[PDB]
């Protein structure tokens, strides 16, 4: 049995850390909602 | 019931465990299907019942229809409001990549958090939720990339 607990407002943070790259990937989505690489 | 980002917890395991995250907006709670499997949720002494869901999209809404309709613009950085298990909410800014599928293109964020972070919102510069984090793929080098998963309003 599951319950929810508030963790914050949904706001853009002006000086947030920036990271992560930007891959372009061919993917397939199956009937179960799982992504796979092509 | 206040708008905002929420942890999804269970006590049926050892201790209290965070199974995911979601978004309360306009009286509707939004998370990923794989987080709750469509089960009812408790909020205080109140109960939230599922209203809409779809395994293939991996989304579910509670108390009303899916309300989030902002979309990535295809050009600008976004922010993941990651809410990791046991950790304070924190914004991470990133330029999305792209999932290319036979049915069109989807934004994707190359950021790796524990599974319990699923349902964390991804935001545009106006603070609008453009999708939820946590349905994705592992790429050739072993790192994780999440679709920006958005429903229909
Ligand atoms: C190997 N992934 C790490 C990434 C992360 C971030 C916050 C808390 C825990 C963890 C696990």
Author numbering:
A (entry chain A): 50 to 87
B (entry chain B): 18 to 170
Question: What did the publication describing this PDB structure actually write?
Answer:
EP is an aspartic protease with the catalytic dyad formed by Asp35 and Asp219 and has served as a model protein for finding inhibitors for other aspartic proteases like β-secretase, a key target for treating Alzheimer's disease.
The protein construct contains the soluble part of the membrane bound NS2B co-factor and the protease domain of the NS3 protease/helicase protein of the Zika virus. For soaking of the NS2B–NS3 Zika protease crystals 40 μl of soaking solution containing 0.1 M sodium acetate pH 4.6, 0.2 M ammonium sulfate, 24% (w/v) PEG 2000 and 5% (v/v) DMSO was added to the reservoir. 0.4 μl of soaking buffer was added onto each dried fragment and incubated overnight with one crystal. Out of the 22 binding events 10 fragments are binding in the S1 subpocket of the active site close to the catalytic triad forming π–π stacking interaction with Tyr161. Eleven of the binding events are at crystal–contact interface sites.
